[PDB]
């Protein structure tokens, strides 16, 4: 009864590896590194939509809420995923955005988002420090889909609530599996959700940053693909004004 019920689906629908298409022969300029990150984002977003569609229960939400939750959570989802890829592939020494777009310190400085990169590297190192297992990683990630909503609620709020709880309960089955002592599960859950909450202020600093960059992007030779431009121009101001907020597991 703490054998997982969505875990096999989570493994079968995990997206594969997406390349940025970055030409590594080129200078580490701000224009070149950001153009590739935005391109990598647009490509990842196609994967996130197809994954979210296949996620158990997601297609029960109102079609509009499907759209709102993908639009508000994509940043945290892709940040958390990259952290994990950074940890598995290079042991957190660098931000492994894609195999053809790996950020060392020099790229972190040239991207003009050095302190945000440092924060991502730290999140990446937690996977090592907390010994996050690959099963815990896939259930934690699905939780991040359900972790940011309008202050006023969605069309079918009570349904979103119910799905969120089912993902909290699945992460709990994955915890309780290889643990025998009654109290140990809630202690592991607490360390895991502290980790999920520290994704939220990173995703907020990256929202501010990409919004600020999109409205000046012509001035600095940074290319935003159309889907990304659209979601950021309309949706991100809602997150910046506090119309849309994260659901924290703990007071902050």
């Amino acid at each position: 009864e703490c054998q997982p019920i969505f875990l096999n689906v989570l493994e079968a629908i995990e997206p594969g590896v997406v390349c940025a298409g970055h030409d590594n022969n080129q200078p580490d300029s701000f224009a070149a590194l950001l153009s590739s990150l935005n391109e990598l984002g647009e490509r990842q977003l196609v994967h996130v939509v197809k994954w979210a569609k296949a996620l158990p229960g997601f297609r029960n939400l109102h079609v509009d809420d499907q759209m709102a939750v993908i639009q508000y959570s994509w940043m945290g989802l892709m940040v958390f995923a990259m952290g994990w890829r950074s940890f598995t592939n290079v042991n957190s020494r660098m931000l492994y955005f894609a195999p053809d777009l790996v950020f060392n310190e020099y790229r972190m400085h040239k991207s003009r988002m050095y302190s945000q990169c440092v924060r991502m590297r730290h999140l990446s190192q937690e996977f090592g420090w907390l010994q996050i297992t690959p099963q815990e990683f896939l259930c934690m990630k699905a939780l991040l889909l359900f972790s940011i909503i309008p202050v006023d609620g969605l069309k079918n709020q009570k349904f979103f609530d119910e799905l969120r709880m089912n993902y909290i309960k699945e992460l709990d089955r994955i915890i309780a599996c290889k643990r025998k002592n009654p109290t140990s599960c809630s202690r592991r859950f607490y360390q895991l959700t502290k980790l999920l909450d520290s994704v939220q202020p990173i995703a907020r600093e990256l929202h501010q940053f990409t919004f600020d960059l999109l409205i000046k992007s012509h001035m600095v030779s940074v290319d935003f693909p159309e889907m990304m431009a659209e979601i950021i121009s309309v949706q991100v101001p809602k997150i910046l004004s506090g119309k849309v907020k994260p659901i924290y597991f703990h007071t902050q």
Binding site: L45, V46, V49, K50, K53, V63, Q66, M67, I70, Q71, M227, E230, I231
Partner: peptide
């Protein structure tokens, strides 16, 4: 378009 992919 987001909306076309969701479809």
């Amino acid at each position: 378009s987001l909306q076309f992919l969701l479809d």
